[PDB]
Every structure is written in structure tokens, then in C-alpha cells.
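Supplementary material to the annual report.
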Amino acid sequence: HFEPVVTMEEDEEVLYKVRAKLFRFDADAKEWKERGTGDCKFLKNKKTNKVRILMRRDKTLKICANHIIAPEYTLKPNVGSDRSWVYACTADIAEGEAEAFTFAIRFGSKENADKFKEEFEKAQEINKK
Amino acid sequence: STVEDMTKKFGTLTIHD
Amino acid sequence: GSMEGILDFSNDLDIALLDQVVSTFYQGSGVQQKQAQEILTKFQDNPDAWQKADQILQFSTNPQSKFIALSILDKLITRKWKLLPNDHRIGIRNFVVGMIISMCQDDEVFKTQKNLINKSDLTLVQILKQEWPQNWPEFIPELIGSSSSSVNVCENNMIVLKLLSEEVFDFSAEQMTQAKALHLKNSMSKEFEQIFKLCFQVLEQGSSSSLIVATLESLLRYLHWIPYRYIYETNILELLSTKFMTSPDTRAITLKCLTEVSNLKIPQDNDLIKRQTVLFFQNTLQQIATSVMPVTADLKATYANANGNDQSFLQDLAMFLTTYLARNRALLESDESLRELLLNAHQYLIQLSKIEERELFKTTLDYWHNLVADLFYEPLKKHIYEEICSQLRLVIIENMVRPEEIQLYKSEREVLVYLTHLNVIDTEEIMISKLARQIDGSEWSWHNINTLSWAIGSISGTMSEDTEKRFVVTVIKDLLGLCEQKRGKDNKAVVASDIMYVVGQYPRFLKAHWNFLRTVILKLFEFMHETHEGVQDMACDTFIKIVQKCKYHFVIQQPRESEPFIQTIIRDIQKTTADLQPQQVHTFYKACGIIISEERSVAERNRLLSDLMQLPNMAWDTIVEQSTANPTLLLDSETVKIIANIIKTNVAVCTSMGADFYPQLGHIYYNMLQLYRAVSSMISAQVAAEGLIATKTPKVRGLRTIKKEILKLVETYISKARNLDDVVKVLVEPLLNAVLEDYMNNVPDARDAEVLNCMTTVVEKVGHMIPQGVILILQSVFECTLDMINKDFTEYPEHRVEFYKLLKVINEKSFAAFLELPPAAFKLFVDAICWAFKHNNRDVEVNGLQIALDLVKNIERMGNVPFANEFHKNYFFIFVSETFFVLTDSDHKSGFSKQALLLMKLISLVYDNKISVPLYQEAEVPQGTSNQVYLSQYLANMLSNAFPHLTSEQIASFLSALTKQCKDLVVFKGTLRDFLVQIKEVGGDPTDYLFA
Amino acid sequence: PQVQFKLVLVGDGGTGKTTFVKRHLTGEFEKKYVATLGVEVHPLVFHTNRGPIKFNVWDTAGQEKFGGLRDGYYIQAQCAIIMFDVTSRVTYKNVPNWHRDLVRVCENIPIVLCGNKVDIKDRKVKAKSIVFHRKKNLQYYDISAKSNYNFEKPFLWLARKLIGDPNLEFVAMPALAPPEVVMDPALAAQAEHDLEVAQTTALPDEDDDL
Ligand SMILES: Nc1nc2c(ncn2[C@@H]2O[C@H](COP(=O)(O)OP(=O)(O)OP(=O)(O)O)[C@@H](O)[C@H]2O)c(=O)[nH]1
Ligand SMILES: [Mg+2]
Ligand code: NA
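Predicted assembly:
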């Protein structure tokens, strides 16, 4: 007998995966600022059945969005785009400490955007319970 | 007809099983 | 807090407060740090701060505070030195020297404060640049003397000499006058005999390795300038190539010294020097083999492991080998006793070439290029390197890069091409067997089959046609077999793509075998229906790539075919392209346009053109009939896209067909310009109904897209048009009517910079034929664009760039248009040019200076006439002083050459008596006074006010030099550069401008 | 973290030093050129397989007349990035000046040379011309703060040299479960006002792929 030669997403399921660019609105200076570009994922916890948005920047893989898809939230259009949504978020923990944000999220096409909105609303229904 | 032979094989090239 | 106390100079400096502030800057964080930073910046920039520097060096215990005190000293020594009393200068020297001696005495401080010592050395060196050797004749003797006493002082003196060498020979060009650079070089050159003896003494005797390393550091610098005798007529080559290569501390620096030694200027006709150059290489390679690693060592593994200094050392070895062998390999190629040394040196390079490091690979690849080029051309050489070259073939092939990385891929292709010529059988064998190791799975991966495909593709056209034929057949057969083996769409897509890549790289083969070419293209058509990511783009890119090379075979009737294949392509074009995205369809149409341009029978070409444009023309006509019946339908964003896509299809075919596209342009031209207007009105309406934010909406951007693609189509045709009579008489007038007024009468945010771009081409090609048209373009775009871009340098960047392009071409092709401008608008033209000067943006700046130069030339060409007379009276000194402003302001250094050229031209006009009128107003100067004298008087006054710290003597000398040198541009430039140095300090030597 | 390294970032004005750092800190691309006065110290953390690694990034000023304690900023630096602009020939001509001033204070530190703004089509400093790094043993990368081309490379390389592990990789930082936070009416009106302004402010670069 020869002796032998010697992320915290584990517990979630992926409902939707889309490529996107997230912006936040600087209140004090009237302009948008990019927060990240990468895969935006809808992750349902297998315990709580709570769906969140989780988005990671490409390459560095730093979290640029982390919040519950609250059933109250409302996707609005942006005047300049037919492939974006803007909505208010009461608590995002991408940086760490919970903070409120006005987000916009833009996609490759109008189709991708429409599908996201449909998925966002599916997730809201799930979170109401 | 090694070229004709290869041309015939090319014509059945696919990305599918 | 109490931190801001040090900025109050009325009191004595509190050192305790200084050191706190410094600590709080270097060791602190957050709000604390930022406030101390502002305080230290303010303390340092206090012009009386140098006075309280000797206090800090003595009393402070914080090495950072001392370092900062020396920065303040440094600023005084380089700028305000010559203004000080002579006793202050001796004082400062004495306590800089003093501090250095005392720091070297204390081994504790010498070991643990190298930063502060090195800074003090640099500071000492600044003083030498001022005072040495005219006011310090004994510096070098006294340095060599004080070297004997303390090993530490000796070490520091080597650091001082290194820095002196750097400052005089390596970094003098930008930073001191020519006269002053020469003075210091001659001064160092004079006393170097004494310096070298001391260096060689230290190297031969050799106590402290830290001393030996610092001496070798200084030698590396000396090797940049010293004459070759010091290296070849002493023992120093033996020491470097043996002694110092064995211990790792000295190895690093020594290897760099021998690299520079390989670059020395050497007589090429002396056998004894040739043998010495061989010897130091033989010694070096021997120490490598016995003290570092043998020839067989896996350097790729070593480099990856990244222990200690291995990566730097392997980098340095590659630089040494490449440099030496580039210059000297011929010395090792005839003597059979040097044959082993030659191949071992090259075997190290083969091993270095396997290292996973892009920038290192480039260094070695440059050498391989030098080598294989030489083996291709030079007689009786290639046989020597057969085994080196065989290994290189595998190294290049396995590290072959995708064509997208253009510089690297090109380099790899050239080397591999040369290597294929030198031994085609070997190259083929290597490639076939690599392909076999893909098929059996042993080396199979996506990346691996990709790199092999890029490699096989690279050598297209090196083999004979016969060999190529058999090779390609084998490669394609095998790759086709590989595709069949593999399961899943992911795998098959990769191999199919590579199959299609190789085929596209072998047009000669395609041209000789029509049946095969036909089959390829039909297969690409099949792939245009595949949704799998990448496939449709691969199909389309390959199609146009094949066509670019094989087009003639698409336009003739091949034997056994019922028609030219272009006809077949056009018939099924709807079916072929049905699943492509718009911009893929456009590529397809462009490819077709390439083929149609080959048909030189006018009748048949026009017929093909109309057949190809069938779908877009029918879409077009239905949409023109619909939209002219009611302008409401253009709100519909679906209709906006369809329209934009028809125009783009026209742009694509026009791009590849150029002059041949005219009939198709004629089909749509009048309706297209009507569409432009209807679209134009639609945009204006939305902006009035919704505000400026309208211009950001999808609907309005859709509409603007239509206008821009229309402007693009017209620009594209006119730029390639051969019949300029039709351009003027059919196109130009409708175009100007459609676009000029619309541009002029829209709010700034609704104007398309593409209008300016289009007009630039129209003026470029046919401006000489439409004088009244060029006037109309200026009138419509000039004043209103200028108002957009003359408030800052940021807003409307495209308009800004296209504006100066348009004025440039107008000033080249139709200068008469500027003569028609009323004097007030001509004044804005001069304002606009001078405004371009002050830009950082290179496109604007370069155009600005060119317009200026060409304007001057245009005015010169007018001869002695009232407009030329009155141009000089009005605008000569504006151009001189505006050109001088950007030369001397330190914010437009990118533009130096053009500024210099402009200024020289302006000054040469007066020097040559080519301005007839006086440049001065009546009774401002005595009547008989020449322009020469007044120009000098004006410039003297101008520079005296702009730079008041300059002496009258300094300015007079500069202008004397500058005006005499206004025929020799490189010298003129030198004088300007001397002026740029002198204005940064006080008490510059006026004699410096006599340098020749 | 408390495994922190001082990084000095130097180069000519307008080369994109500040813009590069800001992209790493927030993800934003700044379009305006607001010249740095002296230096701004910015803590920057990466999560690796060998734990987290913090850089104290001393972003220094490129413009001569905003220079501050020029080389005073380099004292006790453990790494550096030298930045130039491949659209600007003079910013490469000055790379040896920056290096000279850098290695006189910091004698033995890992340094990366970055050629910024490769996103721009009309490149002035050609690839074949960039060779200064070879003899000075600098790592070189073509980068773009705008397109994010290679923007992570400089920090990954320095991370490897400083920790002394060639196999070190960036990994996905842990993603905690986010809260529920039902919203009060007390912050509704102020948030709604921001939303109003946001919808009627066009998103930038609408021509980009994302
Ligand atoms: N196209 C392009 N522009 C860039 C890039 N990075 C920065 N810029 C722009 O270049 C300008 C200068 O950026 P800064 O970061 O302020 O330059 P800096 O090096 O910090 O200048 P100093 O602080 O004065 O030394 C800004 O307008 C940026 O938007 C890039 O990758 N591509
Ligand atoms: Mg900055
Ligand atoms: Na190739």
C-alpha cells in the first residue's frame, strides 16, 4: 500500500443573468456616474426565497450592486435611452454600509432591457410573500 | 483529385451533431 | 489646529511643530493628512523658506523634514542662485558639504538614512552645476583625497560622481543651455583620468561590496560618454567579465556595464580589439554556465517562480546577448574554436524566448529578426544556425499571436516567413505534427488550435505553388477531420472558424481552384444563418477578406458555370442575408461592391450595381412615396431605422466602388436631399416642443443618424469621384442648399459637426472650381461655429476639430474666400487661428499653426499690394507675440517645432525686406528706420515686460542670435531652447547665445 | 486591511492618472480635466486568494506649476506607476525624467509603466517605439481608463511582486445578504425629487455598446 501523493453565493440559485452597465445619480452635481460594468444576476436564496440583484465589475469582480428587488420599486424610463431603467433603491451594500441610491442600468439592446423588466417584476412577486 | 476529394469533404462541414 | 503656525515667519521656526506636521503627512491619514499637505506645500513655496533650511538640517531629528529642507534649497540653487550675495553661496556650499561628511562619519546614520544622504548628494551636485569648476577648481582632487580616509565617504563620493555624470551627459539637453552643457562636459572630460584611476583602484582592490556596487553603478554612467581606451587599454574588461560576474550583488550591475560596453565606439580594423571583444563575451558566458545556470536550464520555469532578482537578471541577460550578438556575432562565425560559444549564446536566447513575458519576448523577437534576415541575405551563414533555427520555428509557432495584435503578429510573421524560406520542409513538418497533436488530444485546446491556425496562416506565399497546394490540402483535410471528431457546437464552431481562417489566408490556392472557392463561399453563406455567437461575424469577415483578394474570379464566367458568380450572389442576396444584423448585411453589400468594381464594361457594371441595389432601392422608393405623402411617418422610429439602414447600405457599396457608384447616387440624390430637409425640420420642431433635452432622445438621435449617414455618403463619393464636372454641376449646389442654412439656423446643440467634415471634402476636391460656393460655406458656418468653440477648450470637441480642418483646406485651396470677408470677420479669422495655438488638443493645435504658416505664405504671395500691406500693419506683431506666448508659457511644448517654424518665417520676412510698408505708425520712431531695427526694439520691449527678471543684455543677445539664425532652423530651435532655460532662472549668461 | 503598501503614481499632466485611480475607487469615468494640486492619497483595496491587499495610492500632480513637494512624495514608496499618454509624444519623452526622479528616492521598488488612452484611434506613440522599460526592468502595459483595457493589470502585477507570489489572483469579494429596509414616508419626497431629476438627465455615452 503506497501512501497518497500529498464568495457567499453558494446558497443561491440564478434566475436571470444579463450583461449591463450600472450608474448612480450624483444629487448635488446634476450628472450620472458609472458604478460598474459586468454580469447582473438575480439570486434567489434557497432558504428565505428572497431574490436580490448582485452585480460584479469585470476583472476586479468588485460588487457594484447588492440589494433586494423590493416589491415597491418601480422601473422608469430615462429620457435619453430605450435600453435603460432608472429606479430608487433604499438600501444597497455594494460598498458595505447600507445607503440609498438612484440607479440606472443599461443593456446591449432594447430586447435585453424589456426582458430584465419582466424578470425584475417576476422577482418582485416572489419577494412579496 | 486530392483537391476535388477535399472540396467534397468541405461541403459537409457543420457546427451540428 | 495649531498646525498652521509654521507658515508665520515673523517668529523663529518651531522645529517640533515642523516635524509633527511632516509626520502627520507621511504617517497620518484622512482629513489630518490633506491639511498638513497643504501646509507643507505652502511652507515650501514660501520664497524666504531657504533661509530657515540650515536650522532644519542641524536641529530637526526627522529625516523627512531634512529632505524637504533640501528640496527648498534645491529650488533656490536652480532658480535664484546667481542673485544671492557671494557669502551666502559659500555658506550654503560649506554646510551642504559639511552635512554630507558628518552623515558619512556616523555609520548608524549612514546605514539607515540613505534617502536623506542621496538627496544631499543631489543637492551638492546642483551646486557643482553652478560653481564647478570655475569657482571650485579642486573639487575632484579633494574628492579623490577624502576617498582614501573613510570607506563610507568613498562610497558616497561614487554616488556623487554618478549623479554628476547623469546631470552633465544624460539629462543636460532639456535643462541647461548648449554653452553650459559643453562647459560641464569638457570639465568632466578634462579631469576624468583622475576619476578613473580611483574607480579602477577600488574595483581591483575591492573591500566593501556596497562600495564595489556603487563604483560599478558610477561606471555604467561613465560608459555613456568616456572614450573606448579606458575599457580596452586597462584590465577592466577581465574584472567585469570574470570577478564581478560570480557574486550576485555585483552581477546585476556588471551585466549592464558589459551591455553598454558592447555599444562603445570602437575602431573596426584592429585584431587585438576584436580578440578582446570576443574574450569578455567568452568569460561572461562561462561565468553564467558555471555560477548561475547551465545552457539546458528551464528559464521559463525560473522566470515564473520569480525568486529574488531572477526576473530582472534574465531580462538583463537577454538585453546583453541581443545587444552583443547584434553587433559582434560575425566575430564568432569564422573561427571554429568560437563555434561552440556562438551556439551556446544563441541557445541561452532560445531558452529566454520560451519565457512567458510579452515585453521580454518582443526584445528577443527583434534579435531573431536581425538574425534570420541576415541568414536569408548573407552568403554561407544559414548552415551555422540550422539547429538554432529549427528550435526557433517551434518557439514562434507555439507563441503565435492573433492578427488583431498588429505590431507583434507582424513581427512574428516576418521571422516565421524568413524561417520558412530557410527550411520549408522543417517548417511544414513542425506544423503538420502540431496539427497531429490536436487530433490525438494530447495538446488539444481552443487556444492551442487557434494559435496553430494563426501560425499556418502567417506563412502564406512563402512555399512554391506546388508545395503550398499539397500543404493546404493536408491542413484543411486534417482540420475537417478534427471538426467531425469533436462534439458540441462550442467545439465545432472553434474548429470551423479556424478552417475558415486558414482558407482566407491562402488566396493563391483559392484563385487556382474555382470549384473549391465556390464551395468555401457557399459554406460561408450557410454559416450566415447560424445564431451561435461569433459565427455570423466570422462568416462575413471571411467573405469580404476572400473577395478583397479573389474578386476577379467572381466577375468572370468560370468554365462550366452558366454565369459570373457575382450574378448568382446577387440573386439570392435576400435569402443569403436574411438572418444577419444590419451592419453585417452592410459588410456583405460592400463585398459585392468590390466585385462589381472589377467589371470595367460600363454597361455591365451599371447593371450589376442596379441589381445589387434592388432591395434598398425598392425599400427606398416605397418609403419616399410614403413619407412625402405625409411627414408624420418619420416620427415612427421603426421607419427611421429602415431609412438609416438603406443609407448605410449605400455608404457601404459607395465605400468599395468610389467613382463607379455615381449612377446609384443619381437614383436617390434629389429625394435624399429632400429627406434631409424633412428630417431637419422634424428635429428643430422636437427641440422647440421639448427643449434641448430633445437632442438626447432616441427619436431625435435616430433622425440625426439619417442626416449624418447622408452627409457620410456624399463625402464618401466626392472624396473618390473622378468626374469633378458632374460633382460641381449636379451635386454641389443642391447639397449646399440642403445643409448650409439648416446648420446656420439651428441652435448650437442641434448642429452636426459632420456638416463641417462633408464641406471640408467638398472644398478639398472641387474648391478650386466653386469660388462663390466656398464664400457661401464660410458665411454659413464660420462665425456661428467660432462662437460655439471660443468660450472654453472643452465644449463641442468635434465641431472644434472639424472647424479648423475646414479653415485649413479653405486657406490651401481657395484663399480668395478670406479676401471677401469684411475686415471685422477677417479679424475673427486671425483671432480663430491664434485661438487654435492655445489648444492642447493636438488636432486643433497642429492645424492652428499650419493655417498661420500658410496664411503668411498666402499674404507673401500677393506681393506688394494694399491688402498685404494692411495685413502686416494689423496682424504681424499679433502673430509674432502670440507665437512667442505659446513657445515660452510651458503649456504648449508638444507644438515647439511648428511654433519655431512659424516664428522663423515671421522673422525672416523682416530680415529679407519682404514687407514694404513700415510696421510702425507715423512718428512713433524716426522716419528712415527699417523694419529690422523696429522688430528688435518691439521684441526687446515685449520680452522685457513678459520676463522682467532678464537683463537688457540677456534679451539683446538672444534676439541678435535669433535673427542671424533665422535661415538655419535647427540652430534657431537651439537658441529658442536656450531662451526657455534662461527664463526659468536668474542671471543667465548672455554669451550662451553665441554658441556655434 | 493592515497589509497596506504605498504606491506613488507619477506622469505628465493630463495622462489620466487621477481618472485611472477614480475608475478603481468608484467605477466612474471622469471626462473633465481637473488638475491635481500636489497629491491626493486614496486607499484602494483588492481581494485576492492570499487575502486582501491595500494600496495607499499617492496620486501626484503632473503639471510643473502644481508640483508641490515634487519628489518628497516618493519617500518610503514601496511601488509605483509611471503614466504617459500614447496620443501625446511629449508625455513619453518625459517618462525617463519621471523615472530618474523616482528611482533617486526609491532605489529598489517594483515599477509599472502604463501607456494610457489606447481607446483613441489616432495613436502617436507607436508600440514599436516603447522600449524604455526594457533596461530599467519596468513592467509595461497598454491601458485605457475609458475602455478599461488592461486597467487591472498594473495592480495585479504589483500585488504579485509585493506579496512575492506569482500565482496570486483577484477573486470575487464576499457578497453579504442585503437588508429589507421598508421605506418611511420621511425620506420619500426627497428621493422622489432626485428620481424626477434623474429621468430627465440623459445617461452619458449612449453610443457605447453598454
Ligand atoms: N480617451 C481617453 N481619455 C482619458 C483616459 N483617461 C483619462 N482621460 C482623460 O484625460 C483627461 C486628463 O485626466 P486626469 O486623470 O485628470 O489627468 P492627470 O494625469 O490626473 O493630470 P494631473 O492631475 O494634472 O497630473 C481627462 O479629461 C480624462 O477624461 C483614457 O483612457 N482615454
Ligand atoms: Mg490628477
Ligand atoms: Na495569419
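Residues 188-199 of chain D form the longest helix (12 residues).
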